[PDB]
Design a protein around this ligand. Structure first.
Ligand code: TRP
Ligand code: TRP
Ligand code: TRP
Ligand code: TRP
Ligand code: TRP
Ligand code: TRP
Ligand code: TRP
Ligand code: TRP
Ligand code: TRP
Ligand code: TRP
Ligand code: TRP
Lengths: 69, 68, 69, 68, 67, 68, 68, 68, 69, 68, 69
């Protein structure tokens, strides 16, 4: 039942990086998206922070935001 | 528990479920032909969903479109 | 207490297909609706995704969408 | 639990409960004559409901009509 | 747990409760005469409610009328 | 738990509690005279309420009026 | 739990609590003089509240007025 | 758990807690002088609150004013 | 659990927490000077809060203003 | 669980966490330079937060501004 | 559990997590370069978040901007 974010890649090679939940913080996975693909990604037991690199249109419960490459 | 609506706008749209857990990889790909709709939840096994291909998508945060 | 989808068949032979919950994903049931019949179907312990094939008017909590045969 | 309102607009409308669980079959059909209203929940035993015949239906997602 | 409001618009209206559980049958029918109102929940014993006769009904999904 | 508000619009209005459970019968009838208000919950013992006599009624679903 | 606000519009208004349980009787009568306000919950002991006398009442369902 | 806001509009206003339980009696009377504000919850010990004297009151149901 | 916002509008404002339980008395008085904001919850130990002095107050029920002696 | 946002409008804004429990004193002070933002929850150890210095503050009840 | 969205408006923005509990200290500083977006929860380990550097911030209370150094 956690929140989720919507990431639409606006160019090739966007990275959606999950950061580890817990006392330690590191990248545990980078999912690479190509232009026009959409990832819908939850917060989870393993992921408590999500970093987006590259150009993407993003939706979350607080509205739209855009990352730039 | 949340769900995503996916409407295929062309043949071969691929809805890809990513594994929940410490590891991340795809565990299922459900292909849709033009005009079919898939309403898919997040689950004990799927904590992220990727859409490839042209599709019209509804989530609780609104509509979004994938481009194939 | 789970969410549900309303499906109204707009032609004969519409299939509402339930996909299994869990590590295994497959179709476990396909409900045939003929023109003008309505099915209101929940997500369940056994059904964690629902596929609609054929021409149908669908309502979810996200609004209306239409499937095309 | 959510519920659905079905108002029959002709005689012989059927409101059909489908079994919860790994098996899916009809377990009951409640017949409604014109102008009767049935207000029916989802339950431990009923995880999908089908309506046949002409009726005005209300759910949390709005009005829909079934036609015979 | 949710409830239904029924107002009888004529004499003889029946508000009928249907059993929760694997089996479905009527376990009670409450008769309403004209102008009487019944407010009735879903319960451990009642998972569906049928209205027969002319009445004004309100639920969470809005108004509907039986005839 | 939900409640209903009843304002008696004439003397002798009866607000009648119906028993929760397998059995359905009246366990109590509260008499209201004109201009009296009763605000009454659903409870462990009361799972349906009946109003007889002229009254103004509010519930979560809005206003309704019973007539004598 | 839900609560009701009652403002006495004249002297000697009674806000009466009816017992929760199989039995229904008055357990307490709170007298309000003109202009006093009582804000009163539903509780383990009180599952219905009756107002006698002229008062302005607010509940989650909006305003209603009891009259002498 | 809810609360009520009381602003005293003159000296000597009393905000009175009534005991939760089978018994209803006062328990505490908080004196507010003019301009003072008390923001008071419903609690394990208090299930009804009376205001005596001139005060501006806010609850989840809106504004109401007591008069001395 | 709910909280109240209090902004002091002059020096020497007191936000007083009253004890939760059968006993009612002041257990703490927090002094605020002009311009300072206190955001205080209701808690296991505080079930009523009194404000003495000129202050601008927000709660879930809206704005109210205390006036000093 | 609730949180406040604090934006420092000058150097040396002081966000002060008060200890949760029968005792009240501050257990931590986080200073912010001009333009920095702190987003801080109510927690097991903090049940009141004081802001000293010029800051722009957002909470669930709207915007408020501390002045130094 | 709540999250905040942070979009860096210049290079070298820091998103800093403060420890939950009786002890308060920084336990992690996530550097964002311009145009990158971080969506970060409150967690069992982070009960406060500080942003330093020019960034556009969304929370459930709306938009706020941090201003750089
Ligand atoms: N296996 C990952 C999948 C995931 C969810 N959200 C993510 C965000 C970024 C990267 C991976 C993910 C997890 O359960 O946490
Ligand atoms: N058996 C899968 C079915 C599923 C649900 N949502 C999905 C999204 C994509 C692919 C598969 C799925 C599950 O329970 O997780
Ligand atoms: N027996 C199935 C019935 C069902 C509910 N929703 C469905 C959607 C599609 C197909 C079947 C169903 C279940 O409980 O899961
Ligand atoms: N005994 C059935 C009654 C029922 C509830 N909703 C229904 C919908 C359709 C048909 C029967 C029902 C059950 O509890 O599940
Ligand atoms: N002793 C009754 C009181 C009651 C509550 N709501 C009612 C409606 C009608 C008649 C009595 C009541 C009970 O707890 O159920
Ligand atoms: N004893 C019944 C009373 C009841 C509640 N709602 C109803 C609707 C119709 C008939 C009876 C009822 C029950 O608790 O279930
Ligand atoms: N001791 C009573 C106090 C009370 C609350 N609400 C009331 C309404 C009317 C009369 C008394 C009360 C109780 O806990 O129930
Ligand atoms: N010790 C009292 C404090 C209190 C809260 N609300 C009140 C209203 C009126 C008087 C006292 C109170 C209690 O916890 O109940
Ligand atoms: N130690 C106190 C801190 C506090 C919270 N809210 C207050 C209101 C007024 C005075 C003190 C407080 C408590 O946990 O209760
Ligand atoms: N491992 C950290 C990750 C994190 C979440 N939100 C943060 C905010 C700032 C810094 C780190 C984080 C945690 O679970 O708490
Ligand atoms: N360790 C502190 C961190 C904190 C959260 N909110 C605060 C507000 C002010 C000062 C410190 C804090 C705690 O978890 O409580």
């Amino acid at each position: 039942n956690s929140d989720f974010v919507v990431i639409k890649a606006l160019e090739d090679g966007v990275n959606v990086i999950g950061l580890t939940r817990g006392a330690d913080t590191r990248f545990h996975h980078s999912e690479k998206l190509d232009k026009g693909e959409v990832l819908i990604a939850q917060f989870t037991e393993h992921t408590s922070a999500i970093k987006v690199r590259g150009k993407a249109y993003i939706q979350t419960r607080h509205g739209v935001i855009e990352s730039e490459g």
